[PDB]
Amino acid sequence: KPTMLTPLEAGVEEEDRQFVTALARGLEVLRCFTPTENTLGNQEIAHKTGLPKPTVSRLTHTLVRLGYLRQDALSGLYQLDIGILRLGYAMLSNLMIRTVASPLMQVLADYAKAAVAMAARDRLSMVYLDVVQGEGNTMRRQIGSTLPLAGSSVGRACLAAMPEDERTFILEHIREREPENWPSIRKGLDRALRDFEDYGYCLSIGEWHRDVNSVAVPLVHKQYGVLVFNCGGPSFQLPREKLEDDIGPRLIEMVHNISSAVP
Amino acid sequence: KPTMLTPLEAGVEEEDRQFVTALARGLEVLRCFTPTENTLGNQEIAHKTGLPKPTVSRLTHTLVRLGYLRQDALSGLYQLDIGILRLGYAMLSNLMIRTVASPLMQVLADYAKAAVAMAARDRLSMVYLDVVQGEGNMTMRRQIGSTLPLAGSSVGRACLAAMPEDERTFILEHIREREPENWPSIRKGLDRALRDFEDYGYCLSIGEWHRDVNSVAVPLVHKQYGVLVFNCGGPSFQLPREKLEDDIGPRLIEMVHNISSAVP
Ligand SMILES: [Ca+2]
């Protein structure tokens, strides 16, 4: 029922004879590419996915023939191709909520002189779906970029608005992946959960990036799932007291307005 | 070796043991969703793809469990979901060639008071990789990853003109089947553009994509990205044919040459 966190891993999941393993694997290959690791061969993809290299070889050959990868003639290495951009825009275009939310986000971004964004979860990350900047505006586009769940304000609000058992399951995953730092990670999360219960937002005061503060408010939506709106920026421009006393309350009111306008 | 236009055709995996048919079929399902077709059920997807309904059912079930589709609990209909963006949307919106092209595109857009874009082909469409609007330009921006049809747009024509002889004919033979009724009307407009490219180095679309939009495009052959195409276009009353042929087109050719010399 919940979205798979680790689709290449067999676990306690009872068998699923409908599941199309080759489709899962080929899409996982595309997910190996990152801004720093943007050119990859079959060996690195096999090490990243844990798949046999001959299996990877069939998938990258197929992805090239379909236009989702391209292969450099000299090196043999692969890179993402622009079919992926077309798919992403088709996805973004079903977010009708943006026509109501974006003007309201720009008003808040202009007041706070900071970025306001809308995000949703995929696996253990939050993904930016729409970003507006204060009229004090860079070249890098941020739609589709990702933030970790536990330390960002958007991930904390997403976890806060989650059912208790589902949060526990995702948190198990994070805990078993970072055993050394988990007590510290969890304390930061516990504090954000108290803020959600007490005030209806979550903060990240330098806990995603040390120089950055942000506040976030979730919106549970029947079609889209849990959407999260945040406002954040340099901690010098947005000290904790400003987020608690001013921006956080404005963000709450903004989300109620969006929520009341969206069927 | 040319990118497949019809990957679900007969006998691919037979000629090519490396071809993973189930992966092709799932991506063909995801391609059914477009900016204007946002919600589809299994039967619409079977009709669009030609695949049997039980086959589509396995593919969509898989895509939902993975987070690439979502399913409405009451209606059973599907939509693309957030996991699609993790396949690489942000990285492709941030190609490093933008750091060379974008400021040059801004200068042209400011001068022309019109939008300047960078595009590349995917199957029978041109996909926008970057778009810059002139300072004080109040035309609605086309979005990153939006598409234009190949045959009637300036960007598609320039792409076809920069192609190898044979690849162009293969694509065009393919376009003659999708649209037999108006093909001689598509052929004539394309032959004009190919002639313009041979003679002058650009391609025009004077209202041949949308009636009140005119645009000029210039291709660039790049060793890594393939054929990139740059265009400059806008309201036809602002950009008459004469302005595009005498002023914008030549400036766009010089811009592409500058881009070409700065990214080796
Ligand atoms: Ca509502």
Side-chain angles (χ1 to χ4, degrees), chain A, chain B residues 1-172 174-264:
Chain A
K1 199 59 214 129
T3 307
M4 292 171 112
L5 292 176
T6 55
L8 303 183
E9 294 193 0
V12 204
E13 293 162 89
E14 273 196 6
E15 61 190 64
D16 179 349
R17 300 225 173 198
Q18 306 333 117
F19 189 79
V20 179
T21 298
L23 176 54
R25 288 174 177 175
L27 296 172
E28 275 316 290
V29 169
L30 300 180
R31 295 172 81 130
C32 289
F33 294 78
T34 71
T36 50
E37 298 201 81
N38 57 73
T39 178
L40 300 170
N42 287 331
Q43 193 52 78
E44 310 99 88
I45 294 159
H47 168 84
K48 288 182 184 293
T49 60
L51 294 169
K53 198 196 167 300
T55 297
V56 172
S57 170
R58 302 186 199 230
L59 302 163
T60 58
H61 169 82
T62 298
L63 292 162
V64 169
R65 304 207 57 197
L66 306 174
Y68 293 98
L69 298 178
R70 60 179 146 86
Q71 186 173 19
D72 193 282
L74 308 186
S75 69
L77 309 174
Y78 302 94
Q79 292 187 275
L80 298 178
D81 207 355
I82 47 75
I84 287 166
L85 190 74
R86 183 181 184 173
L87 220 49
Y89 180 64
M91 193 262 132
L92 294 166
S93 302
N94 74 31
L95 298 169
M96 299 190 296
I97 184 168
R98 283 175 313 165
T99 74
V100 164
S102 278
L104 293 169
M105 296 162 55
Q106 189 65 65
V107 168
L108 181 60
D110 288 339
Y111 172 80
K113 297 179 193 106
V116 173
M118 182 180 75
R121 183 177 68 85
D122 176 75
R123 296 193 185 169
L124 305 176
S125 298
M126 297 304 289
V127 183
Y128 277 180
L129 305 178
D130 195 20
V131 185
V132 299
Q133 304 285 156
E135 280 313 294
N137 142 250
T138 178
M139 218 201 316
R140 176 180 70 95
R141 298 180 184 281
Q142 297 177 54
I143 288 174
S145 63
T146 58
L147 291 80
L149 218 38
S152 59
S153 77
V154 281
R156 289 164 168 192
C158 179
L159 288 163
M162 255 183 232
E164 192 166 290
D165 47 43
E166 281 189 17
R167 177 173 58 237
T168 290
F169 184 74
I170 286 151
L171 288 183
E172 295 288 347
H173 254 81
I174 293 163
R175 183 188 189 245
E176 83 179 284
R177 291 159 82 102
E178 212 157 352
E180 254 156 27
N181 293 294
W182 170 255
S184 185
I185 291 156
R186 183 188 160 183
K187 207 96 196 98
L189 183 49
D190 290 349
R191 282 191 281 273
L193 297 182
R194 295 170 194 166
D195 278 356
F196 184 69
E197 294 183 56
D198 293 347
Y199 310 120
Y201 56 66
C202 296
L203 302 172
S204 179
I205 300 315
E207 292 205 85
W208 167 60
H209 286 186
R210 291 161 233 189
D211 57 308
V212 169
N213 291 346
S214 168
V215 59
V217 173
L219 192 179
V220 176
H221 191 283
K222 44 178 157 171
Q223 177 175 54
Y224 306 116
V226 182
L227 294 172
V228 186
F229 297 81
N230 69 356
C231 178
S235 67
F236 169 77
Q237 175 64 32
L238 299 177
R240 163 193 285 276
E241 62 72 24
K242 193 182 216 276
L243 301 178
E244 296 176 336
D245 290 355
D246 190 21
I247 303 314
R250 288 175 186 263
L251 187 54
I252 290 175
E253 170 80 352
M254 188 194 79
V255 172
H256 166 90
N257 288 330
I258 294 171
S259 182
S260 302
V262 174
Chain B
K1 231 136 113 173
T3 308
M4 313 179 76
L5 305 178
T6 59
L8 296 205
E9 69 181 45
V12 203
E13 202 177 68
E14 295 178 279
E15 313 164 280
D16 179 4
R17 154 188 155 116
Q18 290 257 104
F19 186 81
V20 182
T21 298
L23 174 54
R25 288 177 175 176
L27 289 163
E28 214 49 49
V29 165
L30 290 171
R31 288 191 175 258
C32 286
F33 297 83
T34 78
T36 56
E37 281 193 280
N38 313 283
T39 298
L40 302 170
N42 284 315
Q43 187 66 81
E44 289 162 284
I45 294 167
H47 176 275
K48 287 179 182 305
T49 59
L51 297 164
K53 206 191 167 213
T55 295
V56 170
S57 285
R58 297 185 60 189
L59 299 165
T60 56
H61 166 82
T62 302
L63 292 166
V64 173
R65 288 201 62 194
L66 290 169
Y68 302 114
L69 292 180
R70 54 180 182 257
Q71 193 179 16
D72 180 295
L74 275 316
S75 79
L77 300 178
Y78 308 95
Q79 298 191 300
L80 294 173
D81 204 358
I82 309 309
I84 294 289
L85 302 172
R86 308 290 301 273
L87 303 173
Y89 178 87
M91 293 168 51
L92 287 160
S93 78
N94 288 310
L95 296 169
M96 284 302 303
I97 188 155
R98 293 177 62 210
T99 70
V100 168
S102 177
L104 293 170
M105 289 161 60
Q106 185 66 70
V107 170
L108 178 57
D110 289 349
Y111 169 74
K113 308 194 175 306
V116 177
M118 179 181 65
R121 182 175 70 88
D122 174 73
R123 288 200 192 180
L124 302 168
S125 297
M126 297 307 293
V127 184
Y128 271 14
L129 316 173
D130 204 3
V131 186
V132 159
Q133 297 231 155
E135 193 173 24
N137 181 21
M138 320 278 235
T139 313
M140 181 209 103
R141 274 145 304 260
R142 292 197 60 85
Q143 300 288 298
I144 307 298
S146 62
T147 60
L148 289 150
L150 223 49
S153 61
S154 86
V155 279
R157 287 161 170 189
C159 184
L160 284 164
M163 251 176 232
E165 177 74 272
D166 58 322
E167 301 201 335
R168 179 194 325 141
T169 338
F170 179 60
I171 287 168
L172 294 192
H174 216 270
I175 285 168
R176 199 168 80 109
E177 312 245 25
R178 208 147 309 267
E179 285 155 39
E181 221 182 337
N182 28 82
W183 165 254
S185 183
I186 291 159
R187 176 85 257 190
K188 185 127 101 185
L190 193 57
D191 278 343
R192 267 191 304 271
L194 298 174
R195 177 62 52 89
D196 275 4
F197 181 72
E198 295 169 357
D199 289 348
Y200 294 150
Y202 55 73
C203 286
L204 306 169
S205 179
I206 305 305
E208 296 164 272
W209 166 62
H210 277 178
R211 281 173 173 87
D212 301 294
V213 171
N214 298 342
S215 158
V216 57
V218 170
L220 165 68
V221 176
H222 196 349
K223 47 193 288 214
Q224 339 284 17
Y225 303 98
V227 189
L228 301 171
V229 188
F230 300 82
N231 72 0
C232 178
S236 54
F237 81 92
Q238 171 181 358
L239 296 170
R241 161 181 295 276
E242 168 168 4
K243 192 170 201 51
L244 294 175
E245 296 182 328
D246 292 1
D247 186 13
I248 301 312
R251 293 168 105 102
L252 181 55
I253 290 168
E254 178 61 19
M255 190 196 79
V256 169
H257 185 268
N258 289 327
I259 296 175
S260 177
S261 54
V263 57

